A paper describes a structure:
Facilitated by the icosahedral symmetry of the capsid, it was reconstructed at 2.9 Å resolution. Although one of the vertices of the capsid is occupied by the portal complex, icosahedral symmetry was applied to maximize resolution. Consistent with structures of the closely related T5 phage, the T = 13 icosahedral capsid of mature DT57C was composed of two proteins, the major capsid protein (MCP) and the head decorating protein (DCP), and it had a diameter of 930 nm. The asymmetric unit comprises 13 copies of the MCP lacking the Δ-domain (the first 160 N-terminal residues, which is cleaved during the maturation process of the capsid). While one of them is located at an icosahedral vertex and contributes to the formation of pentamers, the remaining 12 form two consecutive proximal and distal hexamers. We observed clear additional map features located at the center of each hexamer, corresponding to the decoration protein. The strongest part of the electron potential map was found at the binding pocket in the center of each hexamer, corresponding to the N-terminal domain. The center of both hexamers, located below the map feature corresponding to the N-terminal domain of DCP, was predicted to be highly negatively charged. Based on the highly negative electrostatic potential at the center of both hexamers, it is likely that the DCP binds to it through such positively charged regions.
Residue numbers in the entry:
A (entry chain E): 162 to 204
B (entry chain F): 205 to 457
C (entry chain A): 307 to 457
D (entry chain A): 205 to 255
E (entry chain H): 256 to 306
Write the structure that this text describes.
């Protein structure tokens, strides 16, 4: 703040750190799971 | 200051050759990813006004409620103006400034004189530059200047019943939803001039309003002046999460 | 300066289209947004020109209220229409339509219409007197817009 | 004559800089406003006829 | 200022009071040590000098 008579050590003590993680929009997946599956038990 | 964490982008696996079925390459490559962070802050807006002790008697009626309501409405007006088109110098950055600095300010073809009006098609074309976030209409907000609204009222594409249902202009004289977007009119857009803006579309969920202190009123008595001073203060700002979600249509040059 | 010089020609080369009338709402500014607080008045010649509008003929154009089916123009662009014959004579730079914010105008009045009958025996006449005291005033210096012919 | 009071327009507060936080400018600027009046009047309309 | 107490995780008042009190104590001891006579008490060093 650096405006009153007394000041804090640095901006680390003027800050609140949050453990919240947020993500943007991700491309939707379409072809990954639209076909039927053919299981195998050999090469 | 408040700081939050932002989850990084996406990696990918690898296809291993059959020859490496026994070597160390059978497990493919290594994925890596580093977090990031974002910050928030606030600005202080304030105003003051004094009333001397000679005027309350020197009047047939009181003059205090007028003073209080004028202070409040001045605060609100300044907030709205700054949020609309404020700069970054000691004030919140306006939506138009964000669009300009994001290169999302689209130069349209409408002229500043009237040679080309503002059409519904031009407004709807802006959804392209929003990329992924433009695919959902329910998460969008459209705001148009007054002149833009009056230009839309004369749009040739919303005139007849055959064209647009029963919501044709000729039957109503007003424009509600446009291309699936609701219309909200604002008067705080800049002046009608070349290169200036007339509309903006905002991803509503991407914008927050940080606030430290709400509207407060501090009254002070000054006996040596025989005045009553009134002080109104608050600390607000307008911040977003990621550099996207805002596109603004502008006039031609 | 609410006198919009429209492109309609008094000589009659170009008629007075409906779009021309609706464009006048732009000049009203903040008061022109809400439709229910407006009144539209047009001259008789303007009304007959409205009846010859290409844009109000077909059913597919304007619902059931096409001119070809009725012959009277009612609401125009959401504005009900009223015809008055007290406009000036059709000439260059003359008004044919008026849009007015209704509540901006008031009618002050001191005394109503009164009739006084006097018997003048020195002249064998009965004098009849009719008097009233009124005016037309508006609150704020706005609220009315009128369009005029070209040239 | 009838006289009516007209309320004036709106003011605007100020964004105080961080440097002036401890000074008197932290209170911002002052907003003023003067009332106004509007007057109404009338006219007389008269006509006469004899028999 | 009022825009510092909110602008910090922890209060800063006890520090202020302590600093003021200790400023008084340091100043008074220094003055009694070698305070001159001009607006301040004469210090023992000054007294011994003048005698």
């Amino acid at each position: 703040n650096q405006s009153s008579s007394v000041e804090v050590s640095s901006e680390s003590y003027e800050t609140i750190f949050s453990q919240r993680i947020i993500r943007d929009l991700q491309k939707e997946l379409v072809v990954g799971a639209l076909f039927e599956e053919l299981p195998m038990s050999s090469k | 200051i408040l700081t939050m964490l932002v989850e990084p982008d996406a990696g990918r696996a690898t296809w291993v050759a059959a020859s490496a079925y026994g070597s160390d390459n059978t497990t493919g490559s290594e994925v890596t990813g580093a977090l990031t962070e974002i910050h928030f802050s606030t600005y202080k807006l304030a105003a003051k006004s004094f009333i001397t002790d000679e005027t309350e008697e020197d009047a047939i009626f009181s003059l205090l409620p007028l003073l209080r309501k004028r202070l409040i409405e001045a605060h609100a007006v300044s907030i709205e103006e700054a949020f609309m088109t404020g700069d970054g110098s000691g004030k919140p950055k306006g939506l138009l400034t964000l669009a300009s600095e994001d290169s999302a300010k689209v130069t349209t073809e409408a002229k500043a004189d009237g040679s080309v009006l503002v059409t519904a098609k031009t407004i709807s074309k802006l959804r392209r530059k929003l990329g992924r976030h433009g695919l959902k209409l329910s998460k969008l907000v459209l705001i148009v200047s007054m002149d833009a609204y009056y230009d839309l009222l004369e749009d040739e594409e919303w005139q007849d019943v055959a064209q647009v249902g029963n919501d044709a202009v000729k039957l109503q004289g007003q424009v509600g939803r446009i291309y699936g977007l609701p219309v909200v009119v604002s008067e705080y857009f800049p002046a009608k001039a070349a290169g200036k803006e007339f509309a903006v579309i905002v991803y509503k969920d991407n914008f927050v309003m940080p606030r430290q202190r709400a509207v407060t009123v501090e009254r002070e008595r000054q006996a040596g002046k025989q005045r009553d001073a009134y002080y109104v203060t608050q600390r607000v700002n307008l911040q977003r999460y990621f550099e996207n979600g805002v596109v603004s249509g502008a006039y031609a040059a």
